[PDB]
Amino acid sequence: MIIVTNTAKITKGNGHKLIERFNKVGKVETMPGFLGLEVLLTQNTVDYDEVTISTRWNAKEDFQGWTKSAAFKDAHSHQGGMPEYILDNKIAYYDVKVVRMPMAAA
Amino acid sequence: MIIVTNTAKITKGNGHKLIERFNKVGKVETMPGFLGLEVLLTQNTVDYDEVTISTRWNAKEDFQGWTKSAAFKDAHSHQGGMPEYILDNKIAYYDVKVVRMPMAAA
Numbered sequence: 001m002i003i004v005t006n007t008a009k010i011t012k013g014n015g016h017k018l019i020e021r022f023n024k025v026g027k028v029e030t031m032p033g034f035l036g037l038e039v040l041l042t043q044n045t046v047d048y049d050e051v052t053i054s055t056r057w058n059a060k061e062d063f064q065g066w067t068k069s070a071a072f073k074d075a076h077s078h079q080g081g082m083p084e085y086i087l088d089n090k091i092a093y094y095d096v097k098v099v100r101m102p103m104a105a106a
Numbered sequence: 107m108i109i110v111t112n113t114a115k116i117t118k119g120n121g122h123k124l125i126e127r128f129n130k131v132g133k134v135e136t137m138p139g140f141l142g143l144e145v146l147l148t149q150n151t152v153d154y155d156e157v158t159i160s161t162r163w164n165a166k167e168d169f170q171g172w173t174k175s176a177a178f179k180d181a182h183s184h185q186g187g188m189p190e191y192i193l194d195n196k197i198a199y200y201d202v203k204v205v206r207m208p209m210a211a212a
């Protein structure tokens with residue numbers, strides 16, 4: 001299981017613009033081995049906003065299948081480019097090593 | 107829903123020791139409002155290992171309850187510094203803004 005994150009440093013007060021763009025049903029959710037997408041807003045950021053798009057996958061090849069897909073090319077078409085309010089963008093890949101679920105579900 | 111993340115930069119090759127410490131049943135899974143814990147290993151880190159412990163909570167109050175509990179005290183009795191392979195420690199808090207679950211492609 002892997003998580004792929006795209007973390008955007010955004011000019012203060014503009015985070016909500018990037019969140020609104022992901023706040024809708026899309027195509028990545030239909031891909032094989034997709035397990036979930038979440039959008040996070042970092043707390044306590046002083047001079048900027050930080051918005052994280054996180055996607056979780058059975059395996060890296062499932063993510064790679066999506067980035068080759070047509071729907072990825074359709075969802076990376078009319079973006080209006082990278083918005084001006086985006087100061088910095090980091091991408092990271094994580095291996096999930098331990099998962100500990102609640103007792104209320106056990 | 108919120109996420110609290112502790113990110114440890116570790117001496118390259120020693121990340122498995124921290125992962126191992128969390129690879130067991132603990133007491134945080136028993137806390138009210140706890141929704142899950144996972145441990146991540148960042149890919150393609152050059153000089154070091156990076157291990158992230160992420161915990162998910164229904165509300166900030168639930169996490170606060172946990173940090174005020176005798177279980178958190180006892181787990182953080184410490185009274186002696188961290189292992190020498192732990193180089194740095196960063197804590198972050200996130201608000202979950204959007205959740206998109208897998209969907210049938212039809």
Ligand code: HEM
Pocket residue numbers: 004005006021022025026027028029037053054055074075076079082089091
């Ligand atoms: C490298 C610079 C990148 C920029 C500037 C960028 C920006 C954007 C923007 C503004 C959208 C809105 C269009 C839409 O959501 O339909 C979008 C689509 C999307 N991007 Fe990126 N992105 C980048 C790379 C990435 C990466 C690394 C991921 C990894 C998860 C990713 C995942 C997505 C997803 C899931 C969507 C939505 C597709 C859907 O709705 O099905 N993107 N991108």
Ligand code: HEM
Pocket residue numbers: 110111112127128131132133134135143159161181182188195197
């Ligand atoms: C800032 C300095 C910190 C140090 C030196 C530290 C150190 C430790 C150590 C050595 C353990 C081992 C106890 C065990 O394996 O159960 C532990 C437990 C743990 N710590 Fe930290 N910690 C720190 C902060 C935090 C914070 C702020 C969080 C917030 C989420 C956190 C999350 C956890 C979790 C989830 C556990 C395991 C709880 C369980 O197994 O029931 N740590 N801590």
